[PDB]
Amino acid sequence: ELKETPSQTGGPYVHIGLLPKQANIEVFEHNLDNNLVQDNTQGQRIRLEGQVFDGLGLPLRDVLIEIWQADTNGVYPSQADTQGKQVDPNFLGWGRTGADFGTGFWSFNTIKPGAVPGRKGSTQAPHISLIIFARGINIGLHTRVYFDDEAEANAKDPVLNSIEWATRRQTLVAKREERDGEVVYRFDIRIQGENETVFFDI
Amino acid sequence: ELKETPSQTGGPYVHIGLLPKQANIEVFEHNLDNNLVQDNTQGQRIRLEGQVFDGLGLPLRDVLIEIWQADTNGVYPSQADTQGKQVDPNFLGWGRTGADFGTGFWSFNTIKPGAVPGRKGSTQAPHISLIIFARGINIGLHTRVYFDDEAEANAKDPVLNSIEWATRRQTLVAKREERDGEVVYRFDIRIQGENETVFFDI
Amino acid sequence: ELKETPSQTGGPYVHIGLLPKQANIEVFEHNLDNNLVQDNTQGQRIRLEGQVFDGLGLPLRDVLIEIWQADTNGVYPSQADTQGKQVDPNFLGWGRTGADFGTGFWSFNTIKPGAVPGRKGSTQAPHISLIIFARGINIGLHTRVYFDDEAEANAKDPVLNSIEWATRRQTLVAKREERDGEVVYRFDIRIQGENETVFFDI
Amino acid sequence: ELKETPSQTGGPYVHIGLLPKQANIEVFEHNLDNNLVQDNTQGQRIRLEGQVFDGLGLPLRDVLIEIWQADTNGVYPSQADTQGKQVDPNFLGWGRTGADFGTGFWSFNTIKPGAVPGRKGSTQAPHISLIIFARGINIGLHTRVYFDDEAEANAKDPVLNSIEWATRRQTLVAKREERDGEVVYRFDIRIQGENETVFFDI
Amino acid sequence: IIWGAYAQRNTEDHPPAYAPGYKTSVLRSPKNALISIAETLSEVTAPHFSADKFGPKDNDLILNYAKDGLPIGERVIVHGYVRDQFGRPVKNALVEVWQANASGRYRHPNDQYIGAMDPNFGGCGRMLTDDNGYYVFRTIKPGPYPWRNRINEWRPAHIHFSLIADGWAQRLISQFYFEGDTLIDSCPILKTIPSEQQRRALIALEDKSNFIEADSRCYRFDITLRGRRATYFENDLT
Amino acid sequence: IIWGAYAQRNTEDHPPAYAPGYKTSVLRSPKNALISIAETLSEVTAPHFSADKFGPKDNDLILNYAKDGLPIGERVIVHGYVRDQFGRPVKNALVEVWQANASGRYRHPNDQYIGAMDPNFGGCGRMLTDDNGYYVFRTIKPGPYPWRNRINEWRPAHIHFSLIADGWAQRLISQFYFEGDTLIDSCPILKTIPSEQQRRALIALEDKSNFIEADSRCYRFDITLRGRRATYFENDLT
Amino acid sequence: IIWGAYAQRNTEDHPPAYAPGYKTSVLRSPKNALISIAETLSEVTAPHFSADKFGPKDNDLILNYAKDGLPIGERVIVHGYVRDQFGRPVKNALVEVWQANASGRYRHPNDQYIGAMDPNFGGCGRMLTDDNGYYVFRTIKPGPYPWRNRINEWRPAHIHFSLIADGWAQRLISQFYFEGDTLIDSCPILKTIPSEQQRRALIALEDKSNFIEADSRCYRFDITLRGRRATYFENDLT
Amino acid sequence: IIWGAYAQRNTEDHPPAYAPGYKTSVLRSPKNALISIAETLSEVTAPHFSADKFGPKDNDLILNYAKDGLPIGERVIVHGYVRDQFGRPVKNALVEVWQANASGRYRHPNDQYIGAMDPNFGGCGRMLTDDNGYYVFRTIKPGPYPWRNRINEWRPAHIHFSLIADGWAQRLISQFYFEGDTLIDSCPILKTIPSEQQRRALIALEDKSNFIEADSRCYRFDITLRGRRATYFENDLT
Amino acid sequence: IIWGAYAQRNTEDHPPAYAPGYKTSVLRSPKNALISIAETLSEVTAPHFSADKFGPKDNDLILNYAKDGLPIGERVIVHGYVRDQFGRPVKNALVEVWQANASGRYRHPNDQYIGAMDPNFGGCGRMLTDDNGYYVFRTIKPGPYPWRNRINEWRPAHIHFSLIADGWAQRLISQFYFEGDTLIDSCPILKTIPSEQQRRALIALEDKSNFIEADSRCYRFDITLRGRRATYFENDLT
Ligand SMILES: O=[N+]([O-])c1ccc(O)c(O)c1
Ligand SMILES: O=[N+]([O-])c1ccc(O)c(O)c1
Ligand SMILES: O=[N+]([O-])c1ccc(O)c(O)c1
Ligand SMILES: O=[N+]([O-])c1ccc(O)c(O)c1
Ligand SMILES: [Fe+3]
Ligand SMILES: [Fe+3]
Ligand SMILES: [Fe+3]
Ligand SMILES: [Fe+3]
Secondary structure, X not given: OOOOOOOOOOOOOHHHHHOHHHHOOOOOOOOOOOEOOOOOOOOOEEEEEEOEEOOOOOEOOOOEEEEEOOOOOOOOXXXXXXXXXXXXXXXXXXXXXXXXXXXXXXXXXXXOOOOOEOOOOOEOOXXXXXXXXXXXXXXXXXXXXXXXXXXXHHHHOOOHHHOOOHHHHHHHEEEEEEOOOOEEEEOOEEOOOOOOOOOEEO | OOOOOOOOXXXXXXXXXXXXXXXXXXXXXXXXXXXXXXXXXXXXXXXXXXXXXXXXXXEOOOOEEEEXXXXXXXXXXXXXXXXXXXXXXXXXXXXXXEOOOOOOOEEXXXXXXXXXXXXXXXXXXXXXXXXXXXXXXXXXXXXXXXXXXXXXXXXXOOOHHHOOXXXXXXXXXEEEEEOOOOEEEEOOEEOOOOOOOOOEEO | OOOOOOOOOOOOOHHHHHOHHHXXXXXXXXXXXXXXXXXXXXXXXXXXXXXXXXXXXXXXXXXXXXXXXXXXXXXXXXXXXXXXXXXXXXXOOEEEXXXXXXXXXXXXXXXXXXXXXXXXXXXXXXXXXXXXXXXXXXXXXXXXXXXXHHHHHHHHOOOHHHOOOXXXXXXXXXXXXXXXXXXXXXXXXXXXXOOOOOOEEO | OOOOOOOOOOXXXXXXXXXXXXXXXXXXXXXXXXXXXXXXXXXXXXXXXXXXXXXXOOEOXXXXXXXXXXXXXXXXXXXXXXXXXXXXXXXXXXXXXXXXXXXXXXXXXXXXXXXXXXXXXOEOOOOEEEEEEOOOOOOOEEEEEEEHHHHHHHHHOOOHHHOOOHHXXXXXXXXXXXXXXXXXXXXXXXXXXXXXXXXXXX | OXXXXXXXXXXXXXXXXXXXXXXXXXXXXXXXXXXXXXXXXXXXXXXXXXXHHOOOOOOEOOOOOOOOOOOOOOEEEEXXXXXXXXXXXXXXXXXXEEOOOOOOOOXXXXXXXXXXXXXXXXXXXXXXXXXXXXXXXXXXXXXXXXXXXXXXXXXXXXXXXXXXXXXXXXXXXXXEEEOOOHHHHHOOOHHHOOOHHHHHOOEEEEOHHHOEOOOEEEEEXXXXXXXXEEEOOOOOOO | OEEEEEOOOOHHHOOOOXXXXXXXXXXXXXXXXXXXXXXOHHHHXXXXXXXXXXXXXXXXXXXXXXXXXXXXXXXXXXXXXXXXXXXXXXXXXXEEEEOOOOOOOOOOOOOOOOOOOOOOOOOEEEEEOOOOOEEEXXXXXXXXXXXXXXXXXXXXXXXXXXXXXXXXXXXXXXXXXXXXOHHXXXXXXXXXXXXXXXXXXXXXXXXXXXXXXXXXXXXXXXXEEOOEEEEOOOOOOO | OEEEEEOOOOHHHOOOOOOOOOHHHOOOOOOOOOEEOOOOHHHHOOOOOOHHHOOOOOXXXXXXXXXXXXXXXXXXXXXXXXXXXXXXXXXXXXEEEEOOOOOOOOOOOOOOOOOOOOOOOOOEEEEEOOOOOEEXXXXXXOOOEEEOOOOOEEEOOEEEEXXXXXXXXXXXXXXXXXXXXXXXXXXXXXXXXXXXXXXXXXXXXXXXXXXXXXXXEEEEOOEEEOOEEEEOOOOOOO | OEEEEEOOOOHHHOOOOOOOOOHHHOOOOOOOOOEEOOOOHHHHOOOOXXXXXXXXXXXXXXXXXXXXXXXXXXXXXXXEEEEEOOOOEOOOOEEEEEOOOOOOOOOOOOOOOOOOOXXXXXXXXXXXXXXXXXXXXXXXXXXXXXXXXXXXXEEOOEEEEEEEOOOHHHOEEEEEEEOOOHHHHHOOOHHHOOOHHHHHOOEEEEOHHHOEOOOEEEEEOOEEEOOEEEEOOOOOOO | OEEEEEOOOOHHHOOOOOOOOOHHHOOOOOOOOOOOOOOOHHHHOOOOOOHHXXXXXXXXXXXXXXXXXXXXXXXXXXXXXXXXXXXXXXXXOEEEEEOOOOOOOOOOOOOOOOOOOOOOOOOEEXXXXXXXXXXXXXXXXXXXXXXXXXXXXXEOOEEEEEEEOOOHHHOEEEEEEEOOOHHHHHOOOHHHOOOHHHHHOXXXXXXXXXXXXOOEEEEEOOEEEOOEEEEOOOOOOO
16 A cells, blocks of 8 residues: 655745746646636626635735535536536536735635535535645645525534534634625635634545 | 754853853953943944843843944944944944843943945845843844834835735834933843744844 | 566577578478568569678678568568558568578578658668677677668668768678679678678667 | 876867867957967977877867977976976967867977986987877877987987887877978877877876 | 545645744644544545646646747656555546746746746646556756745755645645755755655656657656545445 | 657676677677667567467477477476566567477587487477467476587576567577576676676576476566657657 | 855754743743844854953853862863864854852852852853864863752753854854763753754863863863855855 | 875776777777886976966856856856875866756757757856865756767766866866766766776765855865875986 | 466465364374375366345345344454465455354354353355455454363454355365454464464454544455466366
8 A cells, every 4th residue: 555645835836837827827728717607607606705814814925725616506526426416517616716916815706506415314514625725834724615694504514513612613604795796705714823714634 | 064063041040151240240350241332432322121021921030132233334343344444443332231130121221323234235224133042042032123213224124124924023123212311212022922023043 | 667688699509499491400380581572572672692700700600690671662561660651561571591501601582672761750771670690699789781772862871870980881881783683782791800890789 | 095086088078168269169268279389489380280090090070189398498387397497488388279070180389399307317309298088088198299300319218218119119209291381290199909109107 | 336435644644734944834834733524525526627628738848838949958758657545546637737947946926036037938737647647748857946944945956746636635736856866855845744755755766768868868756646445335425 | 659769778787799708709799889879660660470370389399399209308388478678568579499408419410419319309499479478388498508618618508589579679589597507607608697687587487386297397487678668749760 | 265154054953942841941932933034244243352351260260259268179171172164263252151069059149059159169251262263261060950840850060151253143152061971861951952963062071181180170172153155256245 | 395206096096998888988999008107307297377367257157158148057156175195285276167058958069969058158167276276166057968878878967177287197187976966877987987986086065054045056076186295315207 | 278277285385184282183183194186177166156145234244133233342344355376366256254253252052151142243244256356344353262272272363264266176264363463373273374474374454544434444354265277288187
């Protein structure tokens, strides 16, 4: 048996290889981005935005974010999905973005995921898997984003209830807002200090 | 090539060897002290005072302080100074003192330094190099003291701008006050916790 | 990664295993020989003959020779040939013979090869790859035979021009002769001394 | 005691660092060359030319040559010279050149050296110390050039008589010629084979 | 075969989050321990990328950004295999890499190192592993990079790489170095890794037999990802 | 897969051409260095031989020359695999072998050794490797052979073998010996090979588990040929 | 010669700021990493002290505080050299030392150890190194000192020393111990130093040949400070 | 002091002239043994070069050929000392160096390697050692160079150097390599040197303490020349 | 491929029949030597079992006998591969196992050990290897068993296994133990095996990466059976 290749920080210039455009490099015709909604994608469109703060309360201006989620019916666009259901043919389920060099804000244009099956015939509340990479971060940090308008589902969610320190569960719930006719969920990540965001080892 | 001799704490009785008088020992006729102003020293005289707090917010009552600075024209009384200018002949530029065993207050009677040249033809804002030694401190802690009445100079200072966490720069600026006709700059040092003072590896 | 099996001399009796007939052994019904021309082989038939001399100028009477060449159109009867052209269906392209125990003369009945593509879109002058094996020879000696009636092609040949000692290029050119209506190319190989034949590490 | 740094071939591009001009590089204002005669240099001017042949009789087209000699009075322009005599103030005594990339010819414009003292109160016949550097040559080859018009001096020369194989002494004697009013000495160097030039370990 | 969950990540084979020697990790490391969870479909699934979207030179850093000429530097080919911890090949995994140029200079707005920029070099590429988990790309060997951890800190020559494969749990970003580089022994980032054997797992080895005459040298570098166990009894994943 | 050129032959893994200890090499070795060349179609191609032309006993030296009886000697089976340096099997390669008989006597007009001839033994065979690069033949173990290098020189027992495979560059002729033979340590021919590990690469190992009861013993001998590299960028070969 | 900056301090050759074993360092160590800076005139300059101000007995701890008699204890001479990391001598550097007396008792108001005070011993001295970086002083060997880290903690015998030399960057305060003292192996303060070789760099060695018959013993102790590099190209310091 | 002759060159510490592994030496090596001679004034004298003729950037390869910008590559400083075999410093010796660029490409008409040319790099410099035999120059680290000995031969990164000092007998041209380069172990040219200790005498060592923050790295390389013996009795040299 | 006979069983790799230390073997071991025979169809053939007859829980000892609840004990999964001595996988071989329960008590009329019986545990299962020779079953780790060889004899924890595969000659019954059990070093039955390497061939190794969180641990145990040789000449078997 072999050992997993050891992790290393993404470094300050992680943008070069993962988000060339942001670094002003135009080598690829097709560039991966933070927009998961296609013309025929199903489900209600939402905007996921926020910031990542360090132990001083300062936003990371060099952080890279990625999300993984299921379609509107809770089916992942992955051969690994064993639900037997058909997935939205126009949904990648994944996206990538980077904080703004100036403000530190990041965002994704996606769809609100449907409930996904949990272990032992349980049902997970809607959520998006998110990972953080950046200078100073030796191993990508895993976390989940739940929605505050799914109070009843979150109360029965297996992963949230696996956290014995109940006061920390709230750090994983994004707040819904409306910019006119657009639904926006605000999710700020706190790496250190008070209200530190819960991070998972998946 | 040889390795630098490893550092060790100064210990609780650092006063014996560095400030005999304070420890009630009269062996030396000439004793080094915290008064850098001589009869003919040039420049405006100022008093530099403050306290050093530990991680509990309690002042260290056994700490030893030393400062190194240039004269009123920004020239160091050191053969290492390559400015080609003549230095104040009546200025040592260095001083030593210890916190009061009871209150923890320390002070120096010195002169406000003139602007010193920075690297690559830049200009440093006026500052005093200060070092802390004490029981619990394995290696002398280096820091700098800038003055709040030199706002414009500090804004362009190379070292201050080398600190990427802008909120911490303020911890290196002393506050000017007036005890009648005397100018006093208050500089409190916080080793741990909130508003922790910035320490340099020079 | 593994290392190539180390070479060894063919020995004085190399004929037993490679040319049984010459050693008076009749075990095989079909015996490999020095005749590459079949009934329907295309191209002008030529005879390739010569001798192999040692450092004393004496012919080797126990040497074994083999040749590898393309058909009349410069296509090799090999799956490794990537020319996309069809090869003469009646041409092996390979042959084997041995010097005469008495005179030291060797010969092959073959076809004059067509020009073969060189590297980087270049064209090689017609040639036959030849290898020598014998007692005293630790590793088979590689060389090439060009024809003197292809002066213009040889002048532009990549391999011949890769030899910086121009005077040696001539050692690789056989001389055309006519035994009535038969074209014969004479190619004498000199292993040592003056006019030593050029040997390649392919 | 330390060991001498091990020698290495000068390589095919030795010209870059030792004769930039010949390699078409103009970095230096003052470039070392093959002209040892200055405006006021004393002595009869001579031209030293020739070629360097390999074991095939082919000239090296990438060889670098250097010479070291005394002035017209047999005094070296070196602090190491212990003759007590004054040396020509306008003579470097050293020069460098390279064979022509096309023909392989090399040459120096210098002065015919005067007789230099030998060991144990003996007198050396006039000579020039010459060294060869090139691809294929692991260690610079040392040799000397004597002149055929100094027959009587050469007969008594210590170094020439130290060569027990008398037939080889002639390989170190250059032949005098006249291109009108110019004296030219031809010195061809043969590294291998017949008439191989004598090389010294000095 | 019915797949179960990915084997637990062995935290001892990775650098901790907090590593005082690597200064920036001090304020960017959680103080709380990571909360381990049993895997669900969310953790064992991952996106799929079709090779159709990739350009012909996406894995050729020597040419994908060349404008008026070729980049200055050491022509090197890097290849290897991607497997899961149980030795199974990882098929069609997205491999993305980025690096500095021959001067040790990055094409990034935040890089102000005196090292010279190469107008013909970009520093980024990508590719998908084949059915054997094999990958191969061409580039210019990056030069060491000075950075401010301690004032005179230098990253040894290195190439950043990222992988997205079959399961979200396999998500991995790391760096590989070149055999023989002396800066390897003193890099604070590389030393955040606990074991010596793991540090060497990030060193690309010279592959001399695969050098291309008068053209390019070659390095061999294999990557190992976490692997899933097979299930033969209860299937709790769902 | 688009194949490139064969990897460069490592001259350090082979005997030099000039080896004073092996006397006949003195006048039959070039004085000039070999001129290395970049490969072309001429070097990477090779002839093909169809098994149809081979007789049923071509790989059976015990029977292919038996006239009135069986040959005198040690019944031995030799088998093994042929691979290229990268471990890939070599399919349908022509393997030809020849040897002396049990007396150490060769069936060749130029052999005048007192050793007795065997009217039922020929000493030569051939075969083609299968799809796995596997080969197998049967023979009589050859006896050591006295020869004149130094007056009392003796070749250890050995079998000469030759291979013609996929590329002309792979053309190879060599010899293999039998594990345990003491003459191996003093043979001038075997000692022309520089390294000790390479000398051992020519020793056939006793394969006891493959002995055939009351019949034959068996030796295992694998052969490694040069291998081609795969091309992923410019294809200069043509 | 045009001097540049002092070489970077190798943090690995010094104790960290936070060392749980040395309790008082827990609340007196920054939680933030030190911010490294490029040096300026401020860091490479330092004050100058003239020997004129020093008394004749400033480097003689046996006599500089003797009132009615000599101090009780082991008469020892300590000397050595001060060099920068590149081996260059450190001239006219201010060396200040302080220690407890033969009882392990310090002449300091805060010291309440039962160990007996010596009315004729002060415990402090100073001196300037000569042109060769040489220094020498006389004292009474200090006795071990009990202190409260863990209730039964004991400092091995030690002498505190401080140096102010040519550059502010060289500012250094440390301690040296005596060869053979068994308390050396269990001191929490000495063990804050990472490497074993560095811990031994603080041990003064018995210098038997320099003992003064029927008078004093002698210890040799050399100190190494950071050194400046020479500049041969751009001079950015200014 | 009255100087005698230079000590005899130890032929065992140098490569022989004939080295079959290095092909071009086959036709460019004398077949006759070198004739050793007793030294005369001719052998112990050498030319003198005044520094006045040298430009300010002659020892700065990064800038002496820069036209429109800086060269692409790894900024490195190389320095060291030149001594004679008896340890005496070699003063005012002419040191000339040349190398390829970061691509492993030489600025020479005969170099046709695909490696990219750098319009701002020349590849040559020179300098004179000071009174301590010290030398120092700046350059771009050269990239390995492919060449035709065996078709896939590669020179490890290297810098060619030449010295002309006090005596003609000291005339020396050689090459130095960089610590850690893996091509060092397989270079036919470097292997012409008999002993292992001598091969290592040509490797420049990383001098980390002399690295210049955010600017250049540094290598230390010392050179040893032949030395003269002193005479105390008969002076036969003349 | 035409198969010949199975390789000869190496009696030295098995326990002898007579082993005084294992008392019951004294009267149940032949005094005559075994008569070896050449194999016939009788020895190379074996029965075939169809998986259709097997129940869904035949390889699940935790559940195949559970009545009112689950068995008391350590939930463990055991898996591995079955190969012949030449490394070839053994397909569709019948594997039968039996063991005591967590108390070290067997569900057999003749077992009167005080150890407690588990009403929900049977102690027997079976399965067929797949196409890769792979097998896997679940059970409760058996406890050590006291027995009367010497009055205080204890079998280490063990699982009895039996195999019926492709040839009657492969018929094998044996036992495997668990890595780390201290009773392994003193068991008279295990010590009937001559070599140390063979004794270790019966120890199942902890397979930590295959543990199932909050459920079961796992052990890896591979079995090697005798293998058939291929025939390339006379086929005497018939
Ligand atoms: O600060 N980091 O983490 C860094 C800085 C530079 C690098 O080239 C890097 O890969 C990481
Ligand atoms: O607490 N400390 O750090 C101490 C205590 C006693 C000492 O003698 C000392 O040198 C240091
Ligand atoms: O002279 N040789 O090279 C020989 C002589 C006898 C042999 O059996 C042989 O294999 C080689
Ligand atoms: O052939 N040689 O000797 C060479 C070829 C290339 C080189 O870079 C070199 O230094 C020497
Ligand atoms: Fe980086
Ligand atoms: Fe103390
Ligand atoms: Fe033979
Ligand atoms: Fe070179």
